[PDB]
Structure 1
Amino acid sequence: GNYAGNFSGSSRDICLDGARLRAECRRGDGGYSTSVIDLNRYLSNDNGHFRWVSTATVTVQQGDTLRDIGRRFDCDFHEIARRNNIQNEDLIYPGQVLQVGGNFWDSARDVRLVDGGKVLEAELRYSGGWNRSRIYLDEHIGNRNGELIHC
């Protein structure tokens, strides 16, 4: 059924400032708050495609390759390599900690909101170029009593 987020149903004057989403969010008392949420914590570039993966740290398991990590957490192994200062074809080791998710902003351009601030659109870098991608923010951005949250 319904999206879990649905911020736009109770927000207005939705705008972008870099990767930070700003809005006037309806409160329970009937007034408004000016609120902000950093989309760079919740959205990632998966080889040319927006994905909902929040900034997180993971621990490499026995038998894991970098692609195995990417598959498990729905991230691009090229991104995991770049973000963790290693290389694409590099071996990884059990017990190793790796940063994953978020950080779409690093590899994006022409970033903007469309359809009244409900859709985020950008060109995202992939292995051999740029791909236009879009994502419905109401999927995971909500308004809790005047405050923009991820849910």
Structure 2
Amino acid sequence: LGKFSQTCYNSAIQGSVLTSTCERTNGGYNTSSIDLNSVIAAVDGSLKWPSNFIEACRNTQLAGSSELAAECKTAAGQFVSTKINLDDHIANIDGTLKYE
């Protein structure tokens, strides 16, 4: 996976955004950016790649009126029960669900 740096140049980071100028298949280049804020996490002082839950969890369900429940895989490899209250961060903003 990855390996952008091998065929890109003029790379820069500002805040959470990576910008680089990269080779196209046909020759020539294109400059683009990617905002990494939501794809890199800071965990106890260490930068980590994301741990999106669907890649580690099964049997997602709504529990009650606001809880997301699932069975998720531990580092040891077993699935354990877990839940999280969606009311912590999901808001009704004038009729539309939004994260805050």
Letter of the 2:85 counterpart: Q
SS at match of 1:40: coil
Deviations 1:70-115 (A, max 9, x none): x859xxxxxxxxxxxxxxxxxxx8473377xxxxxxxxxxxxxxxx
Are residues 56 and 33 of structure 1, via their aligned partners in 2, closer, same or farther at CA, if it must alter by over 3 Å? farther
TM-score normalised by length of structure 1:
0.38
CA contact (8 A) 1:15 1:22 kept: yes
How many residues in Structure 1 have an aligned counterpart in Structure 2?
70
Matches within 5 A, 1:2-151: 4-53=1-50, 59-61=68-70, 94=83, 96-97=85-86
TM-fit CA distance, 1:22: 0.2
Higher percent of residues as helix: 1
Detail structure 1 runs of 4+ shifted over 4 Å in the superposition: 54-58
TM-fit CA distance, 1:39: 1.2
How far, CA to CA, are the matches of 1:10 and 1:96 in structure 2? 43
Are residues 96 and 28 of structure 1, via their aligned partners in 2, closer, same or farther at CA, if it must alter by over 3 Å? same
Higher percent of residues as strand: 2
Are residues 18 and 31 of structure 1, via their aligned partners in 2, closer, same or farther at CA, if it must alter by over 3 Å? same
SS at match of 1:8: helix
Letter of the 1:37 counterpart: I
> Which has the higher Rg, Structure 1 or Structure 2?
2
Q: What residue number does 1:103 align with?
A: none
Higher RCO, 1 vs 2 (CA within 8 Å, ≥6 residues apart): 1
Which ranges of structure 2 fall in alignment gaps of 5 or more residues?
A: 55-59, 61-67, 76-81, 90-100
Percent of aligned positions that are identical: 27
Indicate the RMSD between aligned Cα atoms, in angstroms: 3.4
Which ranges of structure 1 fall in alignment gaps of 5 or more residues?
A: 63-68, 74-92, 100-151
